[PDB]
Scaffold this active site. Structure first.
Site, short mmCIF file in Angstrom:
data_model
loop_
_atom_site.label_atom_id
_atom_site.label_comp_id
_atom_site.label_asym_id
_atom_site.label_seq_id
_atom_site.Cartn_x
_atom_site.Cartn_y
_atom_site.Cartn_z
N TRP A 130 -21.52 39.94 23.56
CA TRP A 130 -22.02 41.36 23.09
C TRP A 130 -23.23 41.44 22.50
O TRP A 130 -23.31 40.62 21.39
CB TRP A 130 -21.03 42.10 22.50
CG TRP A 130 -21.10 43.60 21.93
CD1 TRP A 130 -21.71 44.39 22.84
CD2 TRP A 130 -21.36 44.01 20.53
NE1 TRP A 130 -21.88 45.56 21.92
CE2 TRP A 130 -21.77 45.21 20.95
CE3 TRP A 130 -20.85 43.75 19.14
CZ2 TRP A 130 -21.69 46.22 19.65
CZ3 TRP A 130 -21.04 44.72 18.14
CH2 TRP A 130 -21.55 46.01 18.53
N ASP A 211 -13.67 38.98 16.10
CA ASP A 211 -14.02 40.54 16.42
C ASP A 211 -13.10 40.86 17.26
O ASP A 211 -12.68 40.40 18.55
CB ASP A 211 -15.36 40.63 17.19
CG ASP A 211 -15.75 41.76 17.57
OD1 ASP A 211 -15.55 42.82 16.89
OD2 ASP A 211 -17.39 41.79 18.22
N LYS A 246 -11.73 52.14 21.00
CA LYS A 246 -11.28 52.08 22.27
C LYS A 246 -9.87 52.26 22.44
O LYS A 246 -9.52 53.18 23.16
CB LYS A 246 -11.94 50.74 23.09
CG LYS A 246 -13.29 50.65 23.01
CD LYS A 246 -13.56 49.53 21.93
CE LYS A 246 -14.91 48.97 21.94
NZ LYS A 246 -15.90 50.04 21.32
C1 LIG Z 1 -17.12 42.93 21.13
C2 LIG Z 1 -17.13 44.40 20.62
N1 LIG Z 1 -17.18 44.45 19.04
C3 LIG Z 1 -17.54 45.65 18.51
C4 LIG Z 1 -17.82 46.71 19.18
C5 LIG Z 1 -18.30 48.20 19.01
O1 LIG Z 1 -16.91 48.75 18.09
P1 LIG Z 1 -17.29 50.12 17.42
O2 LIG Z 1 -18.73 49.70 16.25
O3 LIG Z 1 -16.04 50.26 16.83
O4 LIG Z 1 -17.74 51.33 18.40
C6 LIG Z 1 -18.00 46.78 20.76
C7 LIG Z 1 -18.26 47.92 21.61
N2 LIG Z 1 -18.85 47.52 22.80
C8 LIG Z 1 -19.36 48.62 23.87
C9 LIG Z 1 -18.19 49.67 24.20
C10 LIG Z 1 -20.35 49.67 23.00
C11 LIG Z 1 -21.47 49.28 22.33
O5 LIG Z 1 -22.46 48.67 22.64
O6 LIG Z 1 -21.13 49.44 20.96
C12 LIG Z 1 -20.01 48.24 24.99
O7 LIG Z 1 -19.94 46.90 25.15
O8 LIG Z 1 -20.73 48.71 25.86
C13 LIG Z 1 -17.52 45.47 21.37
O9 LIG Z 1 -17.49 45.39 22.79
#
Ligand SMILES: Cc1ncc(COP(=O)(O)O)c(CN[C@@](C)(CC(=O)O)C(=O)O)c1O
Ligand SMILES: Cc1ncc(COP(=O)(O)O)c(CN[C@@](C)(CC(=O)O)C(=O)O)c1O
Lengths: 396, 396
Positions: A130, A211, A246
């Site tokens: 990510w 994570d 999610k």
């Molecule tokens: C690996 C990972 N860790 C954390 C998060 C974000 O979680 P949040 O802060 O609780 O929303 C994600 C989220 N990834 C998304 C779904 C959205 C984004 O970029 O924040 C994505 O990959 O599109 C991930 O994946």
């Protein structure tokens, strides 16, 4: 003062939501941000959630501040999710949890804590992962170094290359592990491989950072915490940044947790007083609503039974969708065989498309994927599956 | 890793909520954190708020992510609150707003933006002010320097000493102004004095940062934005960090805003792309619920008329309470005259008690104030007023 400021480049993921809102042509398909869609292409607020909100609407008498680490039911419920109900970490009072705005907020409060209270100066992240991992840790001052992970040419976990990359990690620095549903590859270590990374991490003195955003989407809540639990059997200190965005469909309510584990309560408490000082100087204390929803579903077996089935309906529809995508691509005559998609976990698939193939899929076909060829399988529906596969076959 | 960590000292304000939960003796009085109480000593969720939540419960179909800067109605409504409906800053598209978790989150995203995109290295804060000002700006790397403000021995704004302190502020650094209801003194500059600080700030090249958490509690929404509006008539760039925690009783939902003003849209946009990159690396995007509540009350004249009267009932009960406190203290035979309390604004009063007087008020009387002698007048009720004044007279 602001005359000389540059324009940040767009976010590889959130920026993608921008030409999707700006593109006209009704055949638009959005395989960008990881957000679940149901069979009708909508991302519904869950029933257990709407019911928990009902309860809160009638049963809440104040919006007075929560206190730095948030609501206590929430913390004890996420520790039991992550660690198992009968855990020694829980009975020994070795773990403290601060409710944070989403998992990103939890990676940042862990980053700020580390940077300011520890000797850590490097965080190790997989190649790939990510993209926002890099910015969060660099925001706090840590430098991010990368380890090998995906064997592209063969679509597996390159365990050798992972170990050997990691042989350069020093005793005392952070290695970031994805709990399950590695983003962006969908490839996770098996349990034998997780206990190998567990043994090697205590031997080398790495501090593990997990994570854990997708608990429930690979195989089930219990089965998905297996790698983390193997790690918490061997380590005396760990940090896990988890999210309920999610698995509770609570994306925009910013619900996550940062759990700090240390060798005994007196130490974890002394460490957590500092983690709370970092939260106070950031956002003060966490948003009540989404975390109260989680606490009330998790504290009530009727709501938890309903929520738990909505989560396994999500997981299973996504698994139906990646079965369908490979088949339809083969029925639309793909030169390449995509059987590997079916082996990946969670909501995405690392397609193997080149940057210019996803640029023209967008430009020519209104098909939106992320530039690494990451595709959101959870946004594929029985109806958009045939235009989508035909756009892909015309681009290979 | 965590063996050698120290224990952060307790927060001068939030830590105080801790012996209040831990003290038994039912005569306990809490004049600590600034949270409004009604005549029965409760901090109710507002009626307009419960109604807005009703509407959202039935009318919301997704919890899908909001996007970095949050919901757009929210931003346009807070800009019209801060700036006035017919403003030139709004018609010229000079201002951009990012919805943040509370006003603290807005001071931190402004601090992180400045630190990373500007040449600023010093922030000037009043002596005294809210203790968390210091930690937020130091968290981002800025150093905090202080200006004179309160004339203690006389209970006024020391305007001379303020100006002369400020003569040491360099062109290009930040001076933090409290919009109204200065925390902790309740003394604000008059409009003539605000336009003097406005003239001097463009002459000296200070970038103004307004912390505006209490709009509505000194005299009324429109009248309380007067100092900020005088400043936005003379400056080409300003940042205001505002909160809806107190005037919407939305404390724990973490609802605030960071508004960036620049000389023209192209510049403010280029500057805001960076502010959004700082939010992405912190919490990703803001908590929907509390800010949707604000947007729906502010977007509907029926809900806004009700909310607007609940806010002036709050302001007026607090003003009744500080009338009553001075009188009761005089009827309980105080050596000192406390007439000055009646001249201060918002929810607190800077009593003038020494640190040892507030330590023994707590220890001997279960009366909780903050160590600077800051007292929360909004937590005083007709029923606790006589034990409270008697504890104070026995300590003078
Ligand atoms: C690996 C990972 N860790 C954390 C998060 C974000 O979680 P949040 O802060 O609780 O929303 C994600 C989220 N990834 C998304 C779904 C959205 C984004 O970029 O924040 C994505 O990959 O599109 C991930 O994946
Ligand atoms: C001057 C000032 N600015 C911001 C805030 C915090 O607003 P929030 O993040 O929207 O909650 C405050 C709050 N001050 C309190 C009421 C509570 C606290 O310490 O956070 C206080 O003085 O007790 C103020 O005052």
């Amino acid at each position: 003062m602001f005359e000389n400021i540059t324009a940040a480049p767009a976010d590889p993921i959130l920026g993608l939501a921008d030409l999707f809102r700006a593109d006209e042509r009704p055949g638009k398909i959005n395989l960008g941000i990881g957000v679940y869609k149901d069979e009708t292409g909508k991302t519904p607020v869950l029933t257990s959630v709407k019911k928990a909100e009902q309860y809160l609407l009638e049963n809440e008498t104040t919006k007075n501040y929560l206190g730095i680490d948030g609501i206590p039911e929430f913390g004890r419920c996420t520790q039991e999710l992550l660690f198992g109900k009968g855990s020694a970490l829980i009975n020994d009072k070795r773990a403290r949890t601060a409710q944070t705005p989403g998992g990103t907020g939890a990676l940042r409060v862990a980053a700020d804590f580390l940077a300011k209270n520890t000797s850590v100066k490097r965080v190790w992240v997989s190649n790939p992962s990510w993209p926002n991992h890099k910015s969060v840790f660099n925001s706090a001052g840590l430098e991010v170094r990368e380890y090998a992970y995906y064997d592209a040419e063969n679509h597996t976990l390159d365990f050798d290359a992972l170990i050997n990359s990691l042989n350069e990690a020093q005793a005392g620095d952070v290695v970031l592990f994805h709990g399950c549903c590695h983003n962006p590859t969908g490839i996770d270590p098996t349990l034998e491989q997780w206990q190998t990374l567990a043994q090697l991490s205590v031997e080398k003195g790495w501090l593990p950072l997990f994570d854990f955003a997708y608990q429930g989407f690979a195989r089930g809540l219990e089965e998905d915490a297996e790698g983390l639990r193997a790690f918490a059997a061997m380590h005396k200190e760990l940090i896990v940044a988890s999210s309920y965005s999610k698995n509770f469909g609570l994306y925009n309510e910013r619900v996550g947790a940062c759990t700090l584990v240390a060798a005994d309560s007196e130490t974890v408490d002394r460490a957590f007083s500092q983690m709370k000082a970092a939260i106070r100087a950031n956002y003060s204390n966490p948003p009540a609503h989404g975390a109260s929803v989680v606490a009330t579903i998790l504290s009530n077996d009727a709501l938890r039974a309903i929520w738990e089935q909505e989560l396994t309906d999500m997981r299973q529809r996504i698994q139906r969708m990646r079965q369908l995508f490979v088949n339809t691509l083969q029925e639309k005559g793909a030169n390449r065989d995509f059987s590997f998609i079916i082996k990946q976990n969670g909501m995405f698939s690392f397609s193997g498309l080149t940057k210019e193939q996803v640029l023209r899929l967008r430009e020519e076909f209104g098909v939106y994927a992320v530039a690494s060829g990451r595709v959101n399988v959870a946004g594929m529906t029985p109806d958009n599956m045939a235009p989508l596969c035909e756009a892909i076959v015309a681009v290979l």
